[PDB]
Amino acid sequence: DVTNVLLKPVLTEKVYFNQMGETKKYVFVVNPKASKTRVKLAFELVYGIKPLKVNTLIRKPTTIRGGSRFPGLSKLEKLAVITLPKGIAISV
Amino acid sequence: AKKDQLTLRGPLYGNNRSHSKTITRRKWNVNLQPCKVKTADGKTTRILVSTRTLRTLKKHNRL
Amino acid sequence: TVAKELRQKSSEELVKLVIKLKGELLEYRFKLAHGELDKPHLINQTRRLLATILTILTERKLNWQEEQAKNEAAVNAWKQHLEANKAKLLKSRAKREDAS
Amino acid sequence: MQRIKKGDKVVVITGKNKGGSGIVLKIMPARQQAIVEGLNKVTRHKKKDQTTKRAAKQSTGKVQQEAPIFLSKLALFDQKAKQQTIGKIKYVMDPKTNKKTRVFKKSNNTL
RNA sequence: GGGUAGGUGGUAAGAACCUCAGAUCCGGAGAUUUCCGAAUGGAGCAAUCCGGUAGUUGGAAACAGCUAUCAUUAAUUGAUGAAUAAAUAGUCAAUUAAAGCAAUACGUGGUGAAGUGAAACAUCUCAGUAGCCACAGGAAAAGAAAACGAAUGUGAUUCCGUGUGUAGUGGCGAGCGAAAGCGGAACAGGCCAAACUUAUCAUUAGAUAGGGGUUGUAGGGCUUGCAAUGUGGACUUGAAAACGAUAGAAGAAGCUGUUGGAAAGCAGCGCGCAAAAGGGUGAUAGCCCCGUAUUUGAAAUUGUUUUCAUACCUAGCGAGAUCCCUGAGUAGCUCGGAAAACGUUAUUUUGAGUGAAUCUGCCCAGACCAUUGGGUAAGCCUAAAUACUAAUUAGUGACCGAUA
RNA sequence: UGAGUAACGCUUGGGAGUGAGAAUCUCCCAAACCGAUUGACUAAGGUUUCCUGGACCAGGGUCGUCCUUCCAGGGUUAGUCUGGACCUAAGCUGAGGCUGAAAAGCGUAGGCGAUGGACAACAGGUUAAUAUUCCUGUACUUACAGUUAGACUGAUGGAGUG
RNA sequence: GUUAAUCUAGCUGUAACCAGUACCGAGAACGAACACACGUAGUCAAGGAGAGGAUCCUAAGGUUAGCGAGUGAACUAUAGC
Known part of the structure; x- marks a missing residue:
């Protein structure tokens, strides 16, 4: 109960396609050390709705800015997708 | 190890020669023998003991 | 300044203020993920205020004094989901018992 | 203390x-310049339009703008007397009204 | 605490803010310090997974958050406890220390090369060097004579110069190289066992804890006297003081013309220095700026030294007496080595055996005996004087200037 | 200098379009190809090269509007699949222990180490980038309570299948 | 334990964690300093003739081998005669 596992909700075209259906999908970026149950509890105690399905995925660090005289690396990121029972939508 | 349990004193390393006076790095091992020692607690225990320390114990009534 | 934090009741009011500031900062960061924030400077100010309150609490004891007594449309959607699941299970069992 | 106070x-x-x-x-003061109004009006060329044709208020031409002046080249002005001499500065005077005050070396006039 | 007007670390232009109700900045003192990592709750492919135990909140629960703990060894203490009755090993519980890293540099110790030189090479040198390993420490090691050694002698040890390329040692070959003494650096000696005695140990204790002494001009213990009340530091704490160290302050003196893009250079007349070190400023500036010599300044932390008080340790001169004690596998001896300048010789040290005396003693003075003289081993401890600089501060350089 | 020479490392044509410029870019139609393979599906390894938009300085053995090149923005979704929390073969580590100048070497109790064992989900659709995972339909397992019916349950250990 | 525990069966509610999941993958992205004719685990495996996954042409599906255009000397390689 610290709510230190919700960094930023992303807004991409895939997301925009996702909420237009009947499920109102939500996606957050999460501290890489937080599990499914931690995210579920945080989401329950941040809006008041108990999620049905909670799924997670990862992005490996990737080389970015190939030509810069210094090759940087993309940061490790973990995303959590949360879905709600059909027929409800909540603002962020 | 090849050392008596009464005092840390192991082998000695030196040079071995012949009539040709050639050098050879050779070790000399202190003699050990498992003779039981009776500690003044009603107990006996076998430990590796040098023969010289064994003579000292024999003359000191320590078995 | 920070001297005004020593004066107040450092038992229960400060921790409630910490929780409220944490919630507001989380909402601020969520707005930062969006376009409608318009006040860049508030993030660092709130972060430093939280750091100061955490220091002044830590000088005495812990932050989490949980030993005390620390939406609404979800019920409708949950009722609909339970009804749908119940109907699916009932029809499945009815067909299963009608098979023989 | 600094020789020049803003204002x-x-x-x-x-x-x-x-x-x-x-x-x-x-x-x-970190790299020792000084900005004074009305002096060193260099002719900036607002090179913005030729980057791309999207922005507004991007091609105005030759515009006068201020340029930094090295701090050591300046001297504070004296006007507390009919015949003034632009002189040195002394920090030693310590009235109780403030921490320290400044005065011209060649005369006795506050600030 | 210092110190004030800008500040939001560099690639930095900027949107949005803080700011003289004393910001940024400097110094001191404080907290969070995720994970790995000696990693130590258990594992592992380092930055991963899985837990047990005790509280606390949600609940009906699985479980989930929020907190704390859970390696080993060694030592100490207690309970438990086998074969075997007791007892021992083992087991459990509790407390206390390490466990590693590095300063490419010093020290001690263990182990320990070859190339090469000898124009080959086995003796030998390299070399007790390199490597590996153990442990440090702020330096380390050594240390108070069983010494030297030829003297009407010096008097712990350590380092430097000399003695000296000497005496010598070497298939007498390459080579190797002291010890006295002298002149310097610094300088100070203390503490245990022993007889004697007290108290306690199934008083058989042989063990535990107290006084007593620290030894060669032989000393100490014993019986018995006189006179101290103090010299003092390898030294416990309290009170103060000085001088530093970690932030800062005050802190002098110029114009005019000139070539000139710009003057500070150049020319004329001036000014100050306990400050003419240095750096910057549109050309080489003492007087444009920061500064610099000097005088000052410490809320807090910290170092050295000084004074007083205080705890422990310490002191001189007699008399008796064949009274007692004065460092045991000890030293020599033999068999092989090794440090010694010596390639094994007294000296020293030891792997195997052998194995004394008690002041009428023992050892030493390069085989040994006798005489003479010197010193008291086989117990322990020690400051400075010596080597080094990865770190911090300031400064220096007939050291370098982008193939350096 | 060798020198604008040797080589440029398994193949074409036409039309339209793009374009500043096209044998090479795009589209269209043909042909010539391997087809137990140059195809469809994945192990180990590469870590973004996958998709979209832009560009052609450098890289493309020619050119280039185009590229596995660069820049900018996105993309992998699991109670059931791959491997953990289940199990063991070599083998590794290893309390106590033995052994060796030291470093260390051996080894017991244990613990790790699958290429194997047990273990419950299938068909279809959707996106440029994912789909036994997202979605529609239909299923199963293992804990967990409350409740209900019946039943004395039967291990760390023994024995057979395994 | 039998004042009940322990499982078994159905109903009601509840839980199911962590890491991989793109693309390439007998090759232009992997190992050969390369957009090299080299090398590499397993799985699918069409029709005619054929014992056959050989041989020939094809199906599904997929490539245009990252220099070319000419002439058709000697000579070289490949083949045919």
Whole structure:
């Protein structure tokens, strides 16, 4: 109960396609050390709705800015997708 | 190890020669023998003991 | 300044203020993920205020004094989901018992 | 203490702009410049339009803008007397009204 | 605490803010310090997974958050406890220390090369060097004579110069190289066992804890006297003081013309220095700026030294007496080595055996005996004087200037 | 200098379009190809090269509007699949222990180490980038309570299948 | 334990964690300093003739081998005669 596992909700075209259906999908970026149950509890105690399905995925660090005289690396990121029972939508 | 349990004193390393006076790095091992020692607690225990320390114990009534 | 934090009741009011500031900062960061924030400077100010309150609490004891007594449309959607699941299970069992 | 306080009048000792007066606005003591209004009006060329044709208020032409002046070239101005001499500065005076005060070496006039 | 007007670390232009109700900045003192990592709750492919135990909140629960703990060894203490009755090993519980890293540099110790030189090479040198390993420490090691050694002698040890390329040692070959003494650096000696005695140990204790002494001009213990009340530091704490160290302050003196893009250079007349070190400023500036010599300044932390008080340790001169004690596998001896300048010789040290005396003693003075003289081993401890600089501060350089 | 020479490392044509410029870019139609393979599906390894938009300085053995090149923005979704929390073969580590100048070497109790064992989900559709995972339909397992019916349950250990 | 525990069966509610999941993958992205004719685990495996996954042409599906255009000397390689 610290709510230190919700960094930023992303807004991409895939997301925009996702909420237009009947499920109102939500996606957050999460501290890489937080599990499914931690995210579920945080989401329950941040809006008041108990999620049905909670799924997670990862992005490996990737080389970015190939030509810069210094090759940087993309940061490790973990995303959590949360879905709600059909027929409800909540603002962020 | 090849050392008596009464005092840390192991082998000695030196040079071995012949009539040709050639050098050879050779070790000399202190003699050990498992003779039981009776500690003044009603107990006996076998430990590796040098023969010289064994003579000292024999003359000191320590078995 | 920070001297005004020593004066107040450092038992229960400060921790409630910490929780409220944490919630507001989380909402601020969520707005930062969006376009409608318009006040860049508030993030660092709130972060430093939280750091100061955490220091002044830590000088005495812990932050989490949980030993005390620390939406609404979800019920409708949950009722609909339970009804749908119940109907699916009932029809499945009815067909299963009608098979023989 | 610093020789120049933001707000007071200043003059220039050496350079092309002899006998010039001005008011100080910005000071960068880390790398030792000084910004005075009305002096060193360099002709900036607002090179913005040719980057791309999207922005507005991007092609105005030759515009006069201020240029930094090295701090050591300046001298504070004296006007507490009919015949004033642009002199040195002394920090030692310590009235109880404030921490320290400043005074011209060649005369006795506050600030 | 210092110190004030800008500040939001560099690639930095900027949108949005803080700011003289004393910001940024400097110094001191404080907290969070995720994970790995000696990693130590258990594992592992380092930055991963899985837990047990005790509280606390949600609940009906699985479980989930929020907190704390859970390695080993060694030592100490207690309970438990086998074969075997007791007892021992083992087991459990509790407390206390390490466990590693590095300063490419010093020290001690263990182990320990070859190339090469000898124009080959085995003796030998390299070399007790390199490597590996153990442990440090702020330096380390050594240390108070069983010494030297030829003297009407010096008097712990350590380092430097000399003695000296000497005496000598070497298939007498390459080579190797002291010890006295002298002149310097610094300088100070203390503490245990022993007889004697007290108290306690199934008083058989042989063990535990107290006084007593620290030894060669032989000393100490014993019986018995006189006179101290103090010299003092390898030294416990309290009170103060000085001088530093970690932030800062005050802190002098110029114009005019000139070539000139710009003057500070150049020319004329001036000014100050306990400050003419240095750096910057549109050309080489003492007087444009920061500064610099000097005088000052410490809320807090910290170092050295000084004074007083205080705890422990310490002191001189007699008399008796064949009274007692004075460092045991000890030293020599033999068999092989090794440090010694010596390639094994007294000296020293030891792997195997052998194995005394008690002041009428023992050892030493390069085989040994006798005489003479010197010193008291086989117990322990020690400051400075010596080597080194990865770190911090300031400064220096007939050291370098982008193939350096 | 060798020198604008040797080589440029398994193949074409036409039309339209793009374009500043096209044998090479795009589209269209043909042909010539391997087809137990140059195809469809994945192990180990590469870590973004996958998709979209832009560009052609450098890289493309010619050119280039185009590229596995660069820049900018996105993309992998699991109670059931791959491997953990289940199990063991070599083998590794290893309390106590033995052994060796030291470093260390051996080894017991244990613990790790699958290429194997047990273990419950299938068909279809959707996106440029994912789909036994997202979605529609239909299923199963293992804990967990409350409740209900019946039943004395039967291990760390023994024995057979395994 | 039998004042009940322990499982078994159905109903009601509840839980199911962590890491991989793109693309390439007998090759232009992997190992050969390369957009090299080299090398590499397993799985699918069409029709005619054929014992056959050989041989020939094809199906599904997929490539245009990252220099070319000419002439058709000697000579070289490949083949045919």
